[PDB]
Design a protein around this ligand. Sequence first.
Ligand SMILES: CC(=O)N[C@H]1[C@@H](OP(=O)(O)O)O[C@H](CO)[C@@H](O)[C@@H]1O
Ligand SMILES: N[C@@H](CC(=O)O)c1cccs1
Ligand SMILES: N#Cc1cccc(N)c1
Ligand SMILES: [Mg+2]
Length: 472
Amino acid sequence: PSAEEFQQLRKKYTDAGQGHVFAFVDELQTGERSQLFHQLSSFDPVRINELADKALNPPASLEPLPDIATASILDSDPKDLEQWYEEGLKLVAGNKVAVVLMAGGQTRLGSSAPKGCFDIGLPSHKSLFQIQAERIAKLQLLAQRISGKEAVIPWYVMTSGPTRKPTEEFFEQHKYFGLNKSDVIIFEQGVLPCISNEGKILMESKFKVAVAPDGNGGIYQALLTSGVREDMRKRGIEHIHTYCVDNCLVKVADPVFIGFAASKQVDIATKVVRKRNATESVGLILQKNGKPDVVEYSEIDKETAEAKDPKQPDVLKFRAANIVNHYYSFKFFESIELWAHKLPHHVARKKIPCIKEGTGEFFKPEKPNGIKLEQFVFDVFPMTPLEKFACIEVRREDEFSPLKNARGTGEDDPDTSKRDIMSQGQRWIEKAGGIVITEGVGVEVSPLISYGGEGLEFLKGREIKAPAFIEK
Ligand SMILES: CC(=O)N[C@H]1[C@@H](OP(=O)(O)O)O[C@H](CO)[C@@H](O)[C@@H]1O
Ligand SMILES: N[C@@H](CC(=O)O)c1cccs1
Ligand SMILES: N#Cc1cccc(N)c1
Ligand SMILES: [Mg+2]
């Protein structure tokens, strides 16, 4: 507001080679001026230059994880599965388990609304959010069955600038899907400015810098400034499940996963499924320089993606596909301030509509004109010793069905999503003794009826005409 303050900021940016952001301040109303001022005050231009330099002029041994760090639901001792399930449910019952939902993604889907609101066309027309909340509701009920006391899994929902407000409205319109409003917290990750190919801050309007969400790796710094970590501490949380909004099969706060990690006493555990083929758009979990790590599908070499296991020439050497289902101890979140700044910035070339520095005409670029920076949630893995890390294989058909693409794509889209949920529901019923007569597919089982296939005895011997919906 004061010329003294506005000039000092203009000197900082102009000294930093970013003076062009003041190019149009004389055309500006006093409100558009204070907006430009406060947004520019929130960035350190010299820090921006450092980020841009490392992204635009940037300056190792890879093996599978050692078996001491891996497990698999597909061949664990059934006694371990039962023990891990029970211990997981006891942790839920003790009110020590929190969930962080990563829902700050806008693009491959072409929907205006947050991805969590999407109706994949199930007979219930439930959104991804609602299905996920109902797994929470159901899990809290199952855990009460082994304590006779209320169980609470707080739901921390991480949004972005783009998705925050519509997410909150959506939850409020659905009355938080029957959870207690005081146990669901919506918070927001931060942003970084978008950077041109020449290292210049890009301007979205004559008074606003173009910025973008700082990647799901922004979760950690967001846990601090939002107050979520403090809330977790107040609730006595000790175990956190973090996952991506787009997976309609996500086993929220999965008791087997939690029990497995807590009994191994790891700082961090993560779920994988067998990679479907060499080109699947998934990060690969592996051992890099003797540490647990993830190579993202956008950064891996073709030679690495196609390497083959020696005695199995038709199988991929690296096939532990990351399904974005992570466990943390609370102790680990208590260290965020020591290492949140060590997280790398990954770089994507983007077409960012902006104002031309010269004339000032808002234009959509032909070719990629700049970059976006993103920290990745899993880049904490190499901070974690192998002995404090666990990677457990799950079943894709039960645990991983991501919504990445629009209806009509043919993979990882609303139709494969719906088909996976309903194939799962039929499978559950059949194992419980039900019969599904199909004349044309599958059955949608509400999470409030069954979290993971239990509680379906009441359908033994009963015939079900697919498509069907089983609800309370
Ligand atoms: C930073 C991050 O979480 N990347 C994840 C995430 O990729 P996306 O770019 O967001 O589609 O989801 C994939 C699973 O669907 C996972 O394999 C990958 O490693
Ligand atoms: N997760 C992706 C998102 C995108 O490509 O838009 C990124 C990789 C590297 C920087 S951003
Ligand atoms: N738990 C824990 C912890 C504390 C400090 C640093 C790292 N890498 C982990
Ligand atoms: Mg193993």
